[PDB]
Design an enzyme around this catalytic site. Structure first.
Site, PDB file in Angstrom:
ATOM      1  N   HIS A  90       0.805  -1.223   0.000  1.00  0.00           N
ATOM      2  CA  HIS A  90       0.000   0.000   0.000  1.00  0.00           C
ATOM      3  C   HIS A  90       0.838   1.272   0.000  1.00  0.00           C
ATOM      4  O   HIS A  90       0.287   2.356  -0.240  1.00  0.00           O
ATOM      5  CB  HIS A  90      -0.931   0.056   1.212  1.00  0.00           C
ATOM      6  CG  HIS A  90      -1.994  -0.992   1.213  1.00  0.00           C
ATOM      7  ND1 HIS A  90      -2.904  -1.119   0.189  1.00  0.00           N
ATOM      8  CD2 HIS A  90      -2.305  -1.949   2.120  1.00  0.00           C
ATOM      9  CE1 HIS A  90      -3.726  -2.119   0.456  1.00  0.00           C
ATOM     10  NE2 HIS A  90      -3.377  -2.644   1.619  1.00  0.00           N
ATOM     11  N   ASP A  98      -2.198 -10.836  -2.036  1.00  0.00           N
ATOM     12  CA  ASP A  98      -2.847 -10.253  -0.870  1.00  0.00           C
ATOM     13  C   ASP A  98      -4.293  -9.920  -1.236  1.00  0.00           C
ATOM     14  O   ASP A  98      -4.591  -9.591  -2.384  1.00  0.00           O
ATOM     15  CB  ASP A  98      -2.064  -9.000  -0.452  1.00  0.00           C
ATOM     16  CG  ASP A  98      -2.534  -8.397   0.854  1.00  0.00           C
ATOM     17  OD1 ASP A  98      -3.628  -7.808   0.897  1.00  0.00           O
ATOM     18  OD2 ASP A  98      -1.785  -8.494   1.847  1.00  0.00           O
ATOM     19  N   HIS A 152      -6.026  -7.476  -0.572  1.00  0.00           N
ATOM     20  CA  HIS A 152      -6.232  -6.064  -0.867  1.00  0.00           C
ATOM     21  C   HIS A 152      -5.454  -5.661  -2.113  1.00  0.00           C
ATOM     22  O   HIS A 152      -4.400  -6.220  -2.415  1.00  0.00           O
ATOM     23  CB  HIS A 152      -5.801  -5.189   0.309  1.00  0.00           C
ATOM     24  CG  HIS A 152      -6.483  -5.534   1.593  1.00  0.00           C
ATOM     25  ND1 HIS A 152      -5.967  -6.449   2.492  1.00  0.00           N
ATOM     26  CD2 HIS A 152      -7.643  -5.087   2.130  1.00  0.00           C
ATOM     27  CE1 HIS A 152      -6.781  -6.541   3.532  1.00  0.00           C
ATOM     28  NE2 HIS A 152      -7.805  -5.729   3.335  1.00  0.00           N
ATOM     29  N   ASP A 160      -4.063 -12.822   3.635  1.00  0.00           N
ATOM     30  CA  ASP A 160      -5.351 -12.411   4.173  1.00  0.00           C
ATOM     31  C   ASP A 160      -6.536 -12.822   3.297  1.00  0.00           C
ATOM     32  O   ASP A 160      -7.682 -12.621   3.715  1.00  0.00           O
ATOM     33  CB  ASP A 160      -5.393 -10.899   4.451  1.00  0.00           C
ATOM     34  CG  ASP A 160      -4.608 -10.064   3.464  1.00  0.00           C
ATOM     35  OD1 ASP A 160      -4.232 -10.553   2.371  1.00  0.00           O
ATOM     36  OD2 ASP A 160      -4.383  -8.869   3.806  1.00  0.00           O
ATOM     37  N   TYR A 196      -3.611 -12.128   8.658  1.00  0.00           N
ATOM     38  CA  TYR A 196      -3.763 -11.774  10.066  1.00  0.00           C
ATOM     39  C   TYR A 196      -4.250 -12.890  10.977  1.00  0.00           C
ATOM     40  O   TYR A 196      -4.267 -12.690  12.199  1.00  0.00           O
ATOM     41  CB  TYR A 196      -4.697 -10.554  10.198  1.00  0.00           C
ATOM     42  CG  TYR A 196      -4.157  -9.464   9.332  1.00  0.00           C
ATOM     43  CD1 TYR A 196      -3.013  -8.760   9.712  1.00  0.00           C
ATOM     44  CD2 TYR A 196      -4.712  -9.204   8.081  1.00  0.00           C
ATOM     45  CE1 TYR A 196      -2.473  -7.790   8.892  1.00  0.00           C
ATOM     46  CE2 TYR A 196      -4.175  -8.239   7.253  1.00  0.00           C
ATOM     47  CZ  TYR A 196      -3.056  -7.538   7.661  1.00  0.00           C
ATOM     48  OH  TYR A 196      -2.515  -6.588   6.833  1.00  0.00           O
TER      49      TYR A 196
HETATM   50  O1  LIG Z   1      -3.977  -6.165   4.981  1.00  0.00           O
HETATM   51  C1  LIG Z   1      -4.100  -5.021   4.559  1.00  0.00           C
HETATM   52  N1  LIG Z   1      -3.449  -4.679   3.366  1.00  0.00           N
HETATM   53  O2  LIG Z   1      -2.709  -5.670   2.765  1.00  0.00           O
HETATM   54  C2  LIG Z   1      -4.938  -4.005   5.300  1.00  0.00           C
HETATM   55  C3  LIG Z   1      -6.084  -4.389   6.004  1.00  0.00           C
HETATM   56  C4  LIG Z   1      -6.888  -3.464   6.691  1.00  0.00           C
HETATM   57  C5  LIG Z   1      -6.547  -2.111   6.696  1.00  0.00           C
HETATM   58  C6  LIG Z   1      -5.400  -1.715   6.016  1.00  0.00           C
HETATM   59  C7  LIG Z   1      -4.606  -2.642   5.321  1.00  0.00           C
HETATM   60  K   LIG Z   2      -3.718  -8.003  -4.265  1.00  0.00           K
HETATM   61 ZN   LIG Z   3      -4.040  -7.189   2.779  1.00  0.00          ZN
END
Ligand SMILES: O=C(NO)c1ccccc1
Ligand SMILES: [K+]
Ligand SMILES: [Zn+2]
Ligand SMILES: [K+]
Length: 357
Positions: A133, A171, A173, A264, A304
């Protein structure tokens, strides 16, 4: 063939002063390392030493202002740390955060160097805080510096500038930072699978939709596979790899594969809401091993559930070591929206990839 492994318990020092149970826990990395020991995978790997990234290496992807402000948090007072973290989207900072982010990046640099100099065939990087991110100029989503993006540029710096690097981001996200850093670049192909929900899922931007195919010279070199309205799992991830990830990757012919390997999307994750199994991640890893003459670096991102990420990442390491892929569960018929998603991406990228036609 040798498999490298990097891990340094110093990366546990980054922590959340206000919420010690925040899910991006120090023990994420020690639990994964422990499971490697427990399964007797660790002794089968060559241990690659961690090191600190340099400020010059951070400048491969990050602005001087961003580097400077994160650098300065090492000596900040608690109120400075709280206020600074709260300027970003979903960031906590401690006096150790900067050093831990340096260690995560430098660990991956050493791993990429070991692969590219032929010392190991492939490698796994058990690192935190995560990276995907993080933007050129800002921190975001528990990430300070974009470890995978820096590793791609680091790889180019020790080989040649046009070295073809594939970043597969599984991932759950979207890796907004990685997309943006390489959006105008045709030397780094970014492929992300992510829960999207029409923009409602973190990081909450329509940048993650399938129609963002890259810009300028990078048109065609950004592939978003966004999931909507379903608890996606092994069937949908296998289908996306069969129809999209592997054909495009083969046509791109990367010389190095980096995996932004968040876990995740795993069954049991408290945030992702998906049900990819450890065997599923093993099959994804085994498929990527057929690219780039096996030159694959697996970089921990999110994930997580401590038990889930430990089982999932250790089975990826098992695959890198050459073990036979385990059987998948009975595959349910593809969820309706997942076919829609794959078809939407196929239409978006058929203009750029002849393997999709
Ligand atoms: O796992 C995450 N990004 O990979 C994440 C999850 C919740 C809030 C911010 C980031
Ligand atoms: K991804
Ligand atoms: Zn993530
Ligand atoms: K790109």
């Amino acid at each position: 063939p040798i498999t490298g492994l990097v891990y340094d318990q110093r990366m546990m020092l980054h922590h959340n002063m206000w919420d010690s149970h925040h899910p991006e826990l120090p023990q994420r990395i020690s639990r994964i390392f422990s499971r490697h020991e427990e399964l007797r995978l660790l002794s089968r790997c060559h241990r690659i030493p961690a090191r600190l990234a340099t400020e010059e290496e951070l400048a491969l992807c990050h602005s001087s202002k961003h580097i400077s402000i994160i650098k300065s948090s090492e000596h900040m007072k608690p109120r400075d740390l709280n206020r600074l973290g709260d300027e970003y989207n979903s960031i906590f900072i401690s006096n150790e955060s900067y050093t831990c982010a340096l260690l995560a990046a430098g660990s991956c640099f050493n791993s990429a160097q070991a692969i590219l100099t032929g010392q190991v065939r492939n490698a796994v990087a058990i690192v935190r805080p995560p990276g995907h991110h993080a933007e050129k100029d800002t921190a975001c989503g528990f990430c300070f510096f974009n470890t995978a993006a820096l590793t791609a540029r680091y790889a180019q710096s020790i080989t040649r500038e046009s070295l073809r690097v594939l970043i597969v981001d599984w991932d759950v996200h979207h890796g907004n930072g990685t997309q943006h850093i390489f959006e105008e670049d045709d030397s780094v192909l970014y492929i992300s699978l992510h829960r999207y929900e029409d923009g409602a899922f973190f990081p909450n931007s329509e940048d993650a939709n399938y129609d963002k195919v890259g810009l300028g010279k990078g048109r065609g070199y950004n592939v978003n596979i966004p999931w909507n309205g379903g608890k996606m799992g092994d069937p949908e991830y296998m289908a996306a790899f069969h129809h999209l990830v592997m054909p495009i990757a083969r046509e791109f012919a990367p010389e190095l594969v980096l995996v932004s390997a968040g876990f995740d999307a795993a069954r049991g994750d408290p945030l992702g809401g998906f049900q990819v199994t450890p065997e599923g991640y093993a099959h994804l890893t085994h498929q990527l091993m057929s690219l780039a003459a096996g030159r694959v670096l697996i970089i921990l991102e999110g994930g997580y559930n401590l038990t889930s990420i430990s089982e999932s990442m250790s089975m990826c390491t098992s695959m890198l070591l050459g073990d036979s892929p385990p059987s998948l569960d009975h595959l349910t018929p593809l969820k309706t929206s997942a076919t829609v998603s794959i078809n939407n991406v196929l239409r978006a990228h058929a203009p750029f990839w002849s393997s999709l036609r």
